[PDB]
Each structure stands twice: as C-alpha cells, then as structure tokens.
Amino acid sequence: SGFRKMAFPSGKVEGCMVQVTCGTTTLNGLWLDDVVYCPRHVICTSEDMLNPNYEDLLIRKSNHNFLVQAGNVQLRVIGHSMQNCVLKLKVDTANPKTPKYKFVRIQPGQTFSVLACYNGSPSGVYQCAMRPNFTIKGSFLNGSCGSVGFNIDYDCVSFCYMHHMELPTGVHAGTDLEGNFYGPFVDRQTAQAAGTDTTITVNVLAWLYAAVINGDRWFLNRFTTTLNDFNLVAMKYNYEPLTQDHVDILGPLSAQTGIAVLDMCASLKELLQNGMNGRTILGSALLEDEFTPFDVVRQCSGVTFQ
Amino acid sequence: SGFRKMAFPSGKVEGCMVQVTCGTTTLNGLWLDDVVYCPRHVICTSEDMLNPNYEDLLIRKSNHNFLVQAGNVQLRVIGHSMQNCVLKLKVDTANPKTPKYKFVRIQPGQTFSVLACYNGSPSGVYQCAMRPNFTIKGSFLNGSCGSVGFNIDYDCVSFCYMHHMELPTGVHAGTDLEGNFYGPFVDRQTAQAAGTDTTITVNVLAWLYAAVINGDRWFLNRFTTTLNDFNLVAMKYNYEPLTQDHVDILGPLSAQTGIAVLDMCASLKELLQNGMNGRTILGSALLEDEFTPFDVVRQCSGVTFQ
Ligand SMILES: *[C@@](O)(c1nc2ccccc2s1)[C@H](C[C@@H]1CCNC1=O)NC(=O)[C@@H]1[C@@H]2[C@H](CN1C(=O)[C@@H](NC(=O)NC(C)(C)C)C(C)(C)C)C2(C)C
Ligand SMILES: *[C@@](O)(c1nc2ccccc2s1)[C@H](C[C@@H]1CCNC1=O)NC(=O)[C@@H]1[C@@H]2[C@H](CN1C(=O)[C@@H](NC(=O)NC(C)(C)C)C(C)(C)C)C2(C)C
DSSP, rough: OOOOBOOOOOHHHHEEEEEEEEEEEEEEEETTTTTTEEEEEGGTTTTTTSOOOOHHHHHOOOOOOEEEEEEEEEEEEEEEEEEEEEEEEESSSSSTTTTSSEEOOOOOTOOEEEEEEEEEEEEEEEEEEEOOOOOOOOOOOOOEEEEEEEEEEEEEEEEEEEEEEETTSSSEEEOOTTSSSSSSSSSSSSSSOOOOOOBOOHOOOOOOOHHHHHHOOOOSOOOOHHHHHHHHHHHHTTOOOHHHHHHHHTHHHHHHHHHOOOHHHHHHHHHHOOOOOOOOOOOOOOOOOOOOOOHHHHHHHHHEEE | OOOOOOOOOOOHHTTTTTEEEETTEEEEEEETTEEEEGGGGGOOOOSSSSSHHHHHHHHHGGGGGGGEEEEEEEEOOOEEEEEEEEEEESSSSTTEEEHHOOOOOOOOEEEEEEEEEEETTTEEEEEEOOOOOOOBOOOTTTTTOOOEEEETTTTEEEEEEEEEEEEEEOOOOETTTTSSSSOOSSSSSOOOOOOOOOOOHHHHHHHHHHHTTTTTTTTTEEEEEEOHHHHHHHHHBBBOHHHHHHHHHHHHHHHHHHOHEEEEEEEEHHHHHHHOOOOOOOTSOOOOOOOOOOHHHHHHHHHOOO
C-alpha cells in the first residue's frame, strides 16, 4: 500500500553525465557512445545572450576550446556540430557505461524523471510532468543546464528532455535530445512568456483511481455522466478536455477497481463544483495531475527494470 | 528556482541489490563486500508468521537452502548468522561495486531516500521521513522486503533502513542495518499499533523558509513571539515541541532570508490558528513536514555528490 511521487532509478543515467566548459561557461553534457550532447549556448558569453548568432559564434570555435571532463578523466574533442539548439561534440572515447537508449519527444501530460546535475555531478532526482503549456515545474539553479529528463522502458533508457532555462514565473523550459524546444521558446534573452496552463484531466482521474486502490473512497458517488456533460464543466475550471482515447487508457484501472470511468468523472465533477471541504485524497488537499495512468499501474503493481 | 521532493541519486545502491530465496519465499538483500544483508523472516513459511522461533527455524537451515542471485549471477552462500532481526549471509564473492558506506540509526524527523526493489531489481526511488511514531509513509507491495533507505554524504552512502512490514493503517516499519527495529514493533504477525503521529515542527519551518527563498511571502507578518508561547500553541495542534537546538539548526536559513526564526514561528502560529484560507505555499495546501533544514539548503544551494 501507499502512494508516492516515485522517480525512476537514476543509475543508468549517472554514468553518462559529464562537464563541458567553453571559456568561463560550464554546464553539463550527456555522453553516449563517442558523442557528448549539451546546450549550444555553452559557447556564449554574457555579452552574447541578448541576440546571439550561433552559426557565427560556433565558426570562431575550435575543438580545443571545449574542455570535457568525465570525473577526473578528460575527454578529447575531435569534432563538433550543431543540431538545432544542441551541440554534438565528438570525442575520442566511447562511454563504456553507455546503456541501451533512445531519444523521444514526449507530449504534454507525460511524466519523466529528472537527474539534476551540477558540474557533471548528480545532485538529485525527481519526477515531474510536461505541462500543457510546454513548461515544467522543476528545481534548477545556476549550472543546472545540460541536466536531462528520462523514462525507463524495461532495459531501455528514453531521454526526452535537456534543460536550458528558467522563466520569470519560476518554471522551466528545455528541448528534446535533438535540440528542438518543447513549446514556443528560444535560447536567447528576449521577452518570452509561457502560455496559460491547465490541469491534465486524465492524470487527475488516474490519481483518483490510485486513491480508491489505496482505500480513499469518500469522493465516490452513485451518479454518472457523459463525456459531453463532463467536458462542459471541465472547461469552466481550466481542465483539459477528455477524449475517448483517455477513456480507453484508463481502462485497466477501471477494471481493477470496478468503478467505470464515466462514474469516476461524476465524482470529479462534484469535486470541482463543491471543493474538497477540508478533506484530503492520498494525503493531499489539491487534485494532483502529475501521475499518468501508467505511473499508477506501475506503482500499484510493482513493475521493475534492468 | 523551484522546489521538489528530491531523492538522492540511486546509482551507488542499485549495484548492491540482490535476490534472496529460501524455499518459496523471495525478497531483497543488500550485498556489501562479501556479505548479503536481508530480513530474517525470509526463512519463514506462512505457517511460522504467527509466533516464529527464529533460533530454531535457523538451526534447521543449511547454506544451500539460500539461493542468492545478483542478476544472472548466482552467489554461493558459505555461511550465515542472525543479528537481531536481520540475516547476514556470507558469500564467496565480494561485490566489486561496493561503494564507500556506513550504517546509521537515524532519529525521527530525519529524511532519507528509498530504493523500492522487487526480485533484486530496482522499481523506483522516493524521499520520505521517519515519523515521530517510528513509521514511514511508504509505497511497498508484496516482495518489497529487503529494500533499503539511505542518505548520501559526499562520497559515502549511509544506509539507515531496511523494509520489513506494513501496518493496518497502510504505513510501514523496518529496521536499521543492524537488525534493530525503529519503534516498538516485532517481526511476527501479532496485533501491533503505531502510536499517535505528530507534525515535525522544525521541518515545517524549514519549508516556510524554502517558500520565502522561492518568493512565497504571503504568510509572513511583523509579529514575533517566544519559544515558550509558541510551544503552547503547537501542543494544541499536535506539533512537536520546538527546542533551542532546532532554533540553532535553522540558523543558515534565517541568515539567508533575513527573517528571524522566532519571527517565522509567529507566522506559523497564525497559520495554525487561522488556516491557509484557500491559499497555497510552494504549490501545497497543507503544511509540509518531510523537508529537513538540511534538505532545504541542499536544494536551494546546489550540493552535489560523487
Ligand atoms: C543554465 O545552467 C545556463 N547557464 C549559462 C551561463 C552562461 C552561458 C550559457 C548558460 S546555460 C541556466 C539555468 C537557469 C539558472 C536558474 N534556473 C535555470 O533554469 N540557464 C540560463 O542561464 C539561461 C541562458 C540565458 C538566460 N537564461 C535564463 O535561464 C535566465 N532566464 C531568462 O533570461 N528568461 C527569459 C524568459 C527572459 C528569456 C535567468 C534565470 C535570468 C538566468 C539563456 C537563455 C541563453
Ligand atoms: C515483505 O516483502 C515480506 N514478505 C514475506 C513473505 C513471506 C515470508 C516473509 C516475508 S517479508 C512484506 C512487505 C509488505 C507487503 C505489503 N506491504 C508491505 O510492506 N512484509 C510482510 O509480508 C510482513 C511479514 C509477515 C506479515 N507482514 C506484513 O506486512 C503483513 N502485516 C502485518 O501482519 N501487520 C501486523 C501489524 C498485524 C503485524 C501484511 C501487510 C498483512 C502482509 C511478517 C511481519 C513476518
């Protein structure tokens, strides 16, 4: 029993972190095989942040300008290339700890674990979700750029985020491993704003299921409803519309608890309209939306990894 | 910026997990050097749970009755001994991944990371706190026994918990690495109850500091108070008394924010008496007490590890 904000074991990723320095700028890089991936603005100085011309900046750099350290070991950069917003530094040595991996661009609502690093060294790990507005509510300080987000599928590590910046609202933005930003952001110091955020309805339902699985049933009722009537209420509260795909996705949990998805939607409807009334669900006073239906199954069934 | 429930990187611990089987019972073990540590009830059958006589049960076991697997590798048990509630199985091979470690018995209020395992394989990681009543609010299912709790101090891993059981209230209990239970519990199926739990006042204050560091200042006031007057209010709300030691411990955070500890105590006093009023602190609607003053510093300063 029990329910926690569970992160994936970080071992396979820790072996891939390195330190990249170019001048006075130091940040993290991901070393897979003979390549080190890192944000391209590692070549910028405080003077270039406002409106950097990356092609130019990079053309004035030579392989010796890049100091890459893997622990006490220094890696020799034998080539470099820029792919969108990331730098790919070719090194003379293949990482012997390279796990089986793949790069993926996730969709909003999906969750992943973050290995926060500083100077090539892992400081900590936590779970978070890609918000509908393409930001994440992270925990990052100076020197954190380069830190990656990932998910583990059996024996494979799926990298899906590389950290780049913080917004005025204290939320964060980054890219996928191919250098493509998630959201409408750019890597330059110009006014940028994250859009209006909304609640991931499908995750909230998965969480209510987790609650039932763990014994909290006070919010349940006999009522029911339709996808149509539900979504009308949802929009009034800044919740993401619910689709048949989401309904099908919640299937396993509906089957496990015997509570029909549309029935659970009625419970939620009432929770939105009348609040929680000083009561809690799974130790919380707010409806949590950073647990995907799969996260719930994984934690309430005991799925392990290599 | 940002604040998350951050766990320690699990890499160093993942290398030490193994699978221990005795008959039909399988659970996890911790392999350090040439020894495998695991809960002693791995030798029990469903028939022995009610009132097991461990000395007897163990006297009827021989080294070949213990199957220990480290991945695809099988480890030969060349000896065994029982230390309080844990079994120490001597093996023919020293773990080559053994990190620099130490065993510690923590005190209530302290936090640590848990590496939940099943069949010797890491399922996930999360941070939790040893409650004043000697239990933890974990996330454990059948097969989880053996999973350990730890903290990382620079380059050293400090093991402080080994999981053993779940209480009717859905909370958990275990021991230190020397087999001594935390709390008044025993490893047998007899009626046992966890005591009344209370809130870790000092952690709540550290969290309010984290809130100020992150920009949430709505709960602050000009008022102040004395340790005496505060503790009177606290007891009425089931909060742990506050001591001068706690005040000294919160020093660095008081210095960093410029808000005096006794001033922060006044803010808290008001929060207890008038509630939060539909407002939140660091994204929460309840006062969080699973962040120690050190956790806050570590996350708001960027402390890393080997
Ligand atoms: C990274 O660790 C980097 N630091 C440097 C330092 C020199 C050159 C390149 C880089 S990348 C850091 C992470 C930040 C620190 C606090 N929280 C984080 O997540 N990111 C940055 O410093 C980016 C870099 C420069 C600005 N920047 C920021 O995050 C700005 N935010 C900002 O300008 N935001 C707008 C929305 C207005 C664009 C602050 C937080 C003010 C430092 C790049 C975008 C190139
Ligand atoms: C461990 O993984 C173990 N499983 C076995 C199976 C056979 C022999 C030995 C062991 S240790 C498991 C973890 C549990 C599972 C659910 N959540 C957990 O944390 N622990 C146990 O099975 C312990 C074992 C037997 C009972 N037990 C329990 O946790 C009971 N709880 C219980 O009896 N609680 C009282 C307070 C009434 C004592 C349940 C949850 C009912 C299985 C030992 C204490 C020897």
